[PDB]
């Protein structure tokens, strides 16, 4: 027996070996797979057919045997585990003798139970087993840590090392001593170092004390578990109360009665999208029908079945535009620059729809009018205690290159901002210069936003030409603002007040004629940015090239705005966009028709 | 910015340069460095030994400070200088042609059509002034203003959105 223990390595070794052999996936084959074999020789196949190491366990397997090993692994886990490692290395040879029997494996148990939650803990559970959870806070940098050093001399090159036990090292008058030629020579570089890092953690299940801040905990790290996870996640912990004193003063060596507590690291509980060709079947099967123009437009919303006339244009931004690349001559940077906006009353579900669209778009950003200023969107320049030095620093837009940022309540922003967006929307660039750096970064994306007026309702006899707070011709300078307003009709209220409350009342969905594919719809969006290059043969030019006389008699008007010779840029954009859907590598000719529809749906809202 | 992930912060690196590497970097530049990470000679409450808590650091000893490089003007032939105008073989022709004015005018705006009057003037701006030898009377000036006004979007801006990309030093 080891000093402060009452166990033996070999008994646990044998019983764990027999347990893994007496195993038919019984934790879910006896209790709850067409496998009447141990999952563990199956898993060593999976480990060796891959040679991808790093197993994990769950402690509910070990109920089927004696409950004693559960107990005597809860009490002394820091002393018992590596016997299971040598059991694993015996199973190695049992699976294959000439295997890679030099790379060692962890063991990652879990799941006794939630204690109650992290607030309610005691002293006596001081070196035993816990599993609690909450939320992640930070993601900090990793630290080496010594275990041995390098040394030297001048005569005969005593080039030596000696390692750590935990905190106690030796040295004779030499290193590799014979006859005492000199005294001890220290270097500390040519050595072995191990990774570790600290990451703070919250409590936020509903296991919360009402009206209380979460009392937070902290966790170390070890080598192949360091930044194992990205922040902003709920994750469970597996570890052991591991304590250390505190140093009174520091000017003296006295020590404080308060031993601290923290948990060690065992296990946690959480190009890369290229598809197989089997999905192309269902994808192109959707593609093959003209109904696709309407199906996805219908299938964005959960059940919202009004103004579907607009989402059929929003798919042109979901199908995020064309790439007429500019590797040709370096000229003019005419991107397929798409921007379209909605504006109307606050009753329409613009903020709600777009919080859902945040739960659709990959590169979802969501601040809004008077959400953050220009500087509140670019150059978050400030001090950081991590370097403890002043830094030239981050922006917001540029994080969403090629993505989207849903925006709300636009007409509250300062005048300093909203001459920033002129730079992007009309040059699609950014160049920055402060007392520190001067910068020429890259950023470009498509805009969405949900402006509102200074009132509750758009005033009739007062067009948007002056209503909202923008210039005389920069108002129309966006592609086309798809006008929105409350349905001024009591008749419609019953249909939604019935259907969308029965929606709650049944609390599940139904796969009706507009077949919602659970995720197979989402690849038709995903795959259709990459393998396509819309091109024009003869199609989407000639109609307005013919009718330009009456289309460009726009000289008439008292203080108006109307048609200008930029429209066809946006028109070719929308055209090759809608030709992307249906995957027509050559341009679509039907697209021109619904493009004209899109335009003249709202381009004489001021005939007056 | 060539590696733009989500989630975490812009993790900061410490980084060092040697003597001849010094002061040929600058703010606002993307780089290609060496990878010679090093042992760097509170809150680290691990075990202590002796016969100590380090942080991370780094150095590197090579630079390619690219995306910020033009080089001024130096047909491999004889000239005033090495390569300032070594294309004499053709510049002789480019200084003697009689239609060179129009051939120059239409040599930068093939993707454009409008008036043909600032396509003959605006070379003005990029062109020289005087640079003469005088006394300490005062500054004598070389270049001069120009103006544009116009109706809404007859390509007022594409004249100049490109001209910044045309010559250097003029952002
Ligand atoms: N056609 C509609 N479909 C769904 N919800 C609607 C509709 N019309 C109005 N609403 C209501 O509008 C609300 C969302 O409005 P919201 O976009 O948050 O307003 P704002 O953007 O002005 O803050 C929802 O609570 C919903 O009940
Ligand atoms: N003669 C011409 N040659 C080339 N493009 C022209 C000509 N006349 C008009 N255009 C078009 O007019 C557009 C003007 O847009 P622009 O003036 O840059 O917008 P803004 O006024 O917002 O800067 C150009 O994109 C260009 O396509």
PDB file of N, CA and C in Angstrom, chain A residues 266-315:
ATOM      1  N   UNK A 266      -9.450  17.352 -16.576  1.00  0.00           N
ATOM      2  CA  UNK A 266      -9.585  15.947 -16.931  1.00  0.00           C
ATOM      3  C   UNK A 266     -10.281  15.911 -18.278  1.00  0.00           C
ATOM      4  N   UNK A 267     -11.447  16.536 -18.367  1.00  0.00           N
ATOM      5  CA  UNK A 267     -12.304  16.383 -19.528  1.00  0.00           C
ATOM      6  C   UNK A 267     -13.383  17.447 -19.462  1.00  0.00           C
ATOM      7  N   UNK A 268     -13.843  17.860 -20.636  1.00  0.00           N
ATOM      8  CA  UNK A 268     -14.878  18.864 -20.779  1.00  0.00           C
ATOM      9  C   UNK A 268     -15.925  18.341 -21.746  1.00  0.00           C
ATOM     10  N   UNK A 269     -17.027  19.079 -21.852  1.00  0.00           N
ATOM     11  CA  UNK A 269     -18.217  18.600 -22.551  1.00  0.00           C
ATOM     12  C   UNK A 269     -18.752  19.703 -23.456  1.00  0.00           C
ATOM     13  N   UNK A 270     -18.357  19.653 -24.719  1.00  0.00           N
ATOM     14  CA  UNK A 270     -18.794  20.649 -25.681  1.00  0.00           C
ATOM     15  C   UNK A 270     -20.275  20.446 -25.956  1.00  0.00           C
ATOM     16  N   UNK A 271     -13.179  24.722 -46.462  1.00  0.00           N
ATOM     17  CA  UNK A 271     -12.617  23.377 -46.462  1.00  0.00           C
ATOM     18  C   UNK A 271     -13.328  22.438 -45.496  1.00  0.00           C
ATOM     19  N   UNK A 272     -13.731  22.926 -44.324  1.00  0.00           N
ATOM     20  CA  UNK A 272     -14.376  22.080 -43.328  1.00  0.00           C
ATOM     21  C   UNK A 272     -15.868  21.864 -43.600  1.00  0.00           C
ATOM     22  N   UNK A 273     -16.373  22.254 -44.780  1.00  0.00           N
ATOM     23  CA  UNK A 273     -17.781  22.085 -45.124  1.00  0.00           C
ATOM     24  C   UNK A 273     -17.972  21.448 -46.496  1.00  0.00           C
ATOM     25  N   UNK A 274     -16.901  20.952 -47.126  1.00  0.00           N
ATOM     26  CA  UNK A 274     -17.025  20.331 -48.440  1.00  0.00           C
ATOM     27  C   UNK A 274     -17.936  19.120 -48.330  1.00  0.00           C
ATOM     28  N   UNK A 275     -18.853  19.001 -49.271  1.00  0.00           N
ATOM     29  CA  UNK A 275     -19.956  18.063 -49.192  1.00  0.00           C
ATOM     30  C   UNK A 275     -19.601  16.781 -49.922  1.00  0.00           C
ATOM     31  N   UNK A 276     -20.385  15.720 -49.743  1.00  0.00           N
ATOM     32  CA  UNK A 276     -20.260  14.561 -50.623  1.00  0.00           C
ATOM     33  C   UNK A 276     -21.105  14.755 -51.867  1.00  0.00           C
ATOM     34  N   UNK A 277     -20.911  13.937 -52.903  1.00  0.00           N
ATOM     35  CA  UNK A 277     -21.739  14.096 -54.104  1.00  0.00           C
ATOM     36  C   UNK A 277     -23.168  13.626 -53.917  1.00  0.00           C
ATOM     37  N   UNK A 278     -23.455  12.837 -52.877  1.00  0.00           N
ATOM     38  CA  UNK A 278     -24.823  12.376 -52.667  1.00  0.00           C
ATOM     39  C   UNK A 278     -25.775  13.534 -52.398  1.00  0.00           C
ATOM     40  N   UNK A 279     -25.303  14.592 -51.737  1.00  0.00           N
ATOM     41  CA  UNK A 279     -26.185  15.719 -51.460  1.00  0.00           C
ATOM     42  C   UNK A 279     -26.539  16.478 -52.730  1.00  0.00           C
ATOM     43  N   UNK A 280     -25.676  16.409 -53.750  1.00  0.00           N
ATOM     44  CA  UNK A 280     -25.930  17.097 -55.012  1.00  0.00           C
ATOM     45  C   UNK A 280     -27.238  16.622 -55.623  1.00  0.00           C
ATOM     46  N   UNK A 281     -27.611  15.364 -55.376  1.00  0.00           N
ATOM     47  CA  UNK A 281     -28.889  14.845 -55.849  1.00  0.00           C
ATOM     48  C   UNK A 281     -30.036  15.708 -55.346  1.00  0.00           C
ATOM     49  N   UNK A 282     -30.183  15.812 -54.023  1.00  0.00           N
ATOM     50  CA  UNK A 282     -31.287  16.579 -53.457  1.00  0.00           C
ATOM     51  C   UNK A 282     -31.153  18.057 -53.793  1.00  0.00           C
ATOM     52  N   UNK A 283     -29.920  18.565 -53.838  1.00  0.00           N
ATOM     53  CA  UNK A 283     -29.709  19.979 -54.126  1.00  0.00           C
ATOM     54  C   UNK A 283     -30.217  20.316 -55.524  1.00  0.00           C
ATOM     55  N   UNK A 284     -29.690  19.633 -56.537  1.00  0.00           N
ATOM     56  CA  UNK A 284     -30.126  19.904 -57.894  1.00  0.00           C
ATOM     57  C   UNK A 284     -31.572  19.485 -58.110  1.00  0.00           C
ATOM     58  N   UNK A 285     -32.084  18.539 -57.317  1.00  0.00           N
ATOM     59  CA  UNK A 285     -33.493  18.186 -57.404  1.00  0.00           C
ATOM     60  C   UNK A 285     -34.368  19.362 -57.006  1.00  0.00           C
ATOM     61  N   UNK A 286     -34.006  20.052 -55.923  1.00  0.00           N
ATOM     62  CA  UNK A 286     -34.660  21.320 -55.621  1.00  0.00           C
ATOM     63  C   UNK A 286     -34.460  22.307 -56.759  1.00  0.00           C
ATOM     64  N   UNK A 287     -33.253  22.335 -57.327  1.00  0.00           N
ATOM     65  CA  UNK A 287     -32.928  23.335 -58.339  1.00  0.00           C
ATOM     66  C   UNK A 287     -33.768  23.167 -59.600  1.00  0.00           C
ATOM     67  N   UNK A 288     -34.218  21.946 -59.888  1.00  0.00           N
ATOM     68  CA  UNK A 288     -34.741  21.619 -61.210  1.00  0.00           C
ATOM     69  C   UNK A 288     -36.124  22.194 -61.478  1.00  0.00           C
ATOM     70  N   UNK A 289     -36.797  22.763 -60.467  1.00  0.00           N
ATOM     71  CA  UNK A 289     -38.176  23.209 -60.591  1.00  0.00           C
ATOM     72  C   UNK A 289     -38.251  24.733 -60.533  1.00  0.00           C
ATOM     73  N   UNK A 290     -39.043  25.394 -61.389  1.00  0.00           N
ATOM     74  CA  UNK A 290     -39.237  26.844 -61.215  1.00  0.00           C
ATOM     75  C   UNK A 290     -39.868  27.230 -59.890  1.00  0.00           C
ATOM     76  N   UNK A 291     -40.484  26.286 -59.174  1.00  0.00           N
ATOM     77  CA  UNK A 291     -41.047  26.574 -57.863  1.00  0.00           C
ATOM     78  C   UNK A 291     -40.000  27.027 -56.848  1.00  0.00           C
ATOM     79  N   UNK A 292     -38.707  26.793 -57.109  1.00  0.00           N
ATOM     80  CA  UNK A 292     -37.663  27.098 -56.130  1.00  0.00           C
ATOM     81  C   UNK A 292     -37.584  28.586 -55.854  1.00  0.00           C
ATOM     82  N   UNK A 293     -37.957  29.410 -56.832  1.00  0.00           N
ATOM     83  CA  UNK A 293     -37.964  30.847 -56.612  1.00  0.00           C
ATOM     84  C   UNK A 293     -38.902  31.207 -55.479  1.00  0.00           C
ATOM     85  N   UNK A 294     -39.967  30.433 -55.298  1.00  0.00           N
ATOM     86  CA  UNK A 294     -40.947  30.735 -54.267  1.00  0.00           C
ATOM     87  C   UNK A 294     -40.804  29.874 -53.025  1.00  0.00           C
ATOM     88  N   UNK A 295     -40.259  28.665 -53.161  1.00  0.00           N
ATOM     89  CA  UNK A 295     -40.185  27.758 -52.016  1.00  0.00           C
ATOM     90  C   UNK A 295     -39.324  28.323 -50.895  1.00  0.00           C
ATOM     91  N   UNK A 296     -38.101  28.751 -51.215  1.00  0.00           N
ATOM     92  CA  UNK A 296     -37.227  29.260 -50.161  1.00  0.00           C
ATOM     93  C   UNK A 296     -37.735  30.590 -49.612  1.00  0.00           C
ATOM     94  N   UNK A 297     -38.273  31.441 -50.490  1.00  0.00           N
ATOM     95  CA  UNK A 297     -38.921  32.677 -50.065  1.00  0.00           C
ATOM     96  C   UNK A 297     -40.043  32.402 -49.074  1.00  0.00           C
ATOM     97  N   UNK A 298     -40.731  31.272 -49.235  1.00  0.00           N
ATOM     98  CA  UNK A 298     -41.768  30.856 -48.302  1.00  0.00           C
ATOM     99  C   UNK A 298     -41.169  30.230 -47.051  1.00  0.00           C
ATOM    100  N   UNK A 299     -39.993  29.619 -47.168  1.00  0.00           N
ATOM    101  CA  UNK A 299     -39.464  28.741 -46.138  1.00  0.00           C
ATOM    102  C   UNK A 299     -38.446  29.419 -45.235  1.00  0.00           C
ATOM    103  N   UNK A 300     -38.123  30.694 -45.468  1.00  0.00           N
ATOM    104  CA  UNK A 300     -37.275  31.403 -44.509  1.00  0.00           C
ATOM    105  C   UNK A 300     -37.990  31.503 -43.166  1.00  0.00           C
ATOM    106  N   UNK A 301     -39.145  32.167 -43.152  1.00  0.00           N
ATOM    107  CA  UNK A 301     -39.849  32.410 -41.909  1.00  0.00           C
ATOM    108  C   UNK A 301     -40.340  31.096 -41.306  1.00  0.00           C
ATOM    109  N   UNK A 302     -40.613  31.070 -39.995  1.00  0.00           N
ATOM    110  CA  UNK A 302     -41.250  29.880 -39.417  1.00  0.00           C
ATOM    111  C   UNK A 302     -42.652  29.675 -39.965  1.00  0.00           C
ATOM    112  N   UNK A 303     -43.493  30.701 -39.812  1.00  0.00           N
ATOM    113  CA  UNK A 303     -44.870  30.659 -40.281  1.00  0.00           C
ATOM    114  C   UNK A 303     -45.371  31.987 -40.832  1.00  0.00           C
ATOM    115  N   UNK A 304     -44.543  33.025 -40.889  1.00  0.00           N
ATOM    116  CA  UNK A 304     -45.001  34.367 -41.240  1.00  0.00           C
ATOM    117  C   UNK A 304     -45.305  34.383 -42.736  1.00  0.00           C
ATOM    118  N   UNK A 305     -46.587  34.530 -43.091  1.00  0.00           N
ATOM    119  CA  UNK A 305     -47.073  34.229 -44.435  1.00  0.00           C
ATOM    120  C   UNK A 305     -47.645  35.484 -45.090  1.00  0.00           C
ATOM    121  N   UNK A 306     -47.053  36.634 -44.781  1.00  0.00           N
ATOM    122  CA  UNK A 306     -47.454  37.914 -45.338  1.00  0.00           C
ATOM    123  C   UNK A 306     -46.211  38.610 -45.859  1.00  0.00           C
ATOM    124  N   UNK A 307     -46.417  39.431 -46.883  1.00  0.00           N
ATOM    125  CA  UNK A 307     -45.335  40.090 -47.604  1.00  0.00           C
ATOM    126  C   UNK A 307     -44.233  39.105 -47.978  1.00  0.00           C
ATOM    127  N   UNK A 308     -44.626  37.960 -48.549  1.00  0.00           N
ATOM    128  CA  UNK A 308     -43.599  37.095 -49.119  1.00  0.00           C
ATOM    129  C   UNK A 308     -43.038  37.645 -50.427  1.00  0.00           C
ATOM    130  N   UNK A 309     -43.571  38.769 -50.914  1.00  0.00           N
ATOM    131  CA  UNK A 309     -43.119  39.422 -52.132  1.00  0.00           C
ATOM    132  C   UNK A 309     -41.728  40.024 -51.989  1.00  0.00           C
ATOM    133  N   UNK A 310     -41.206  40.118 -50.766  1.00  0.00           N
ATOM    134  CA  UNK A 310     -39.954  40.802 -50.491  1.00  0.00           C
ATOM    135  C   UNK A 310     -38.819  39.817 -50.239  1.00  0.00           C
ATOM    136  N   UNK A 311     -39.078  38.750 -49.475  1.00  0.00           N
ATOM    137  CA  UNK A 311     -38.038  37.777 -49.166  1.00  0.00           C
ATOM    138  C   UNK A 311     -37.493  37.137 -50.431  1.00  0.00           C
ATOM    139  N   UNK A 312     -38.319  37.057 -51.477  1.00  0.00           N
ATOM    140  CA  UNK A 312     -37.846  36.637 -52.792  1.00  0.00           C
ATOM    141  C   UNK A 312     -36.757  37.552 -53.344  1.00  0.00           C
ATOM    142  N   UNK A 313     -36.608  38.762 -52.806  1.00  0.00           N
ATOM    143  CA  UNK A 313     -35.474  39.603 -53.139  1.00  0.00           C
ATOM    144  C   UNK A 313     -34.377  39.461 -52.107  1.00  0.00           C
ATOM    145  N   UNK A 314     -34.750  39.139 -50.868  1.00  0.00           N
ATOM    146  CA  UNK A 314     -33.741  38.962 -49.831  1.00  0.00           C
ATOM    147  C   UNK A 314     -32.914  37.719 -50.113  1.00  0.00           C
ATOM    148  N   UNK A 315     -33.486  36.733 -50.813  1.00  0.00           N
ATOM    149  CA  UNK A 315     -32.710  35.575 -51.247  1.00  0.00           C
ATOM    150  C   UNK A 315     -31.568  35.966 -52.168  1.00  0.00           C
TER     151      UNK A 315
END
